[PDB]
Design a protein around this ligand. Structure first.
Ligand SMILES: COc1cccc2sc3nncn3c12
Lengths: 198, 195
């Protein structure tokens, strides 16, 4: 069930794997980051191998793939974090109950950015005592989405006369999405941790 | 991998199945309720057949069975719901983001049906009908809760990310459990009843 490219974790359930510059895997993430964060410098990129988070995420993805009509349900997005949160996210993923209020709120959930520049703001990727900033690269089940609203604690219904049939996520703008908000556990898999500095 | 006791769903993924009174399954669930709620009249008991919620719950159960290195992680508990919330719970299960919550900001489950039978939880609808779930809950290894928790405490603060599975009001004689994650609770039956 675990991806074949992962390092052997010899019965362990969790490993952070340091990537090598020059490998396609490192270079693709560096390029995705530098597209909007060219003024910052990457210290390192770690692949997050969390068996339990992966299993629960892949179950949710299979369900969304069944429910939705041949939709690309998954986007690769960014999430800036403070150093104090990194151990919890690595082990347990993204908990909406711990999320800050966003400067522009489209609901009470976990926020993910299309552009690394957004997540690179000190408000999200707070510099630690050594000047290191931390950003996850995250597989997010955006599914079918609509423009969010500050009051939401779950995604809104697609149809007001069927209140239980929900959008998968919300966004700031359906025409030009720059952020997505998810409201359920195991809808986002933290795949890489970028450590970076000015 | 849907349970044998489920009945065929004609290739659908969600069904509420009304149980036949006086058959073994109805009798078992009725007895669990009447242990503390024998003064309440049961209108019906429905089996909740939600393939997606069951899948996600069974994955969490398998994980908790590995993590705890032992397999007594599940309890059968009660939860009272207002009528307006029953369709959401049937389809999406319990949501901590949706009464006093003095043991933490999670989903609450009662050991005794009598606790969930309070009108503050199982709010009577226009017709006096009250609604209570019988819930499979992954209580796992638990500790005493306290106000304002957003996750269970660590089992050892040397390792702040290795958490208890749930919290309770009283570890020696628990009457309520709180879980803080989606898919730690599977709503298995819905009881419709009157005072
Ligand atoms: C203390 O118990 C609850 C606190 C908050 C909500 C509920 S819904 C329910 N059903 N049985 C008990 N509860 C509770």
């Amino acid at each position: 069930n675990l991806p074949e490219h992962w390092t052997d974790m010899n019965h362990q359930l969790f490993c952070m794997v340091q990537l090598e510059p020059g490998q396609s895997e490192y270079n693709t993430i560096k390029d995705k980051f530098t597209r909007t964060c060219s003024s910052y410098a990457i210290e390192k990129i770690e692949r997050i191998q969390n068996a339990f988070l992966w299993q629960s995420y892949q179950v949710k993805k299979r369900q969304m793939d069944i429910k939705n009509d041949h939709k690309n349900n998954e986007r690769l997005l960014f999430h800036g974090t403070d150093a104090d949160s990194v151990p919890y996210v690595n082990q347990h993923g993204f908990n909406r109950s711990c999320a800050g209020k966003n400067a522009v709120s489209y609901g009470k959930g976990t926020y993910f950015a299309v552009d690394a520049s957004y997540s690179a703001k000190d408000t999200y990727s707070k510099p630690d005592s050594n000047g290191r900033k931390h950003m996850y690269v995250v597989r997010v089940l955006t599914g079918v989405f609509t423009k969010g609203r500050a009051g939401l604690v779950t995604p809104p219904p697609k149809n007001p006369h069927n209140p239980t049939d929900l959008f998968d996520s919300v966004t700031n703008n359906t025409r030009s999405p720059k952020l997505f908000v998810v409201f359920f556990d195991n809808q986002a898999y933290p795949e890489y941790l970028i450590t970076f500095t000015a």
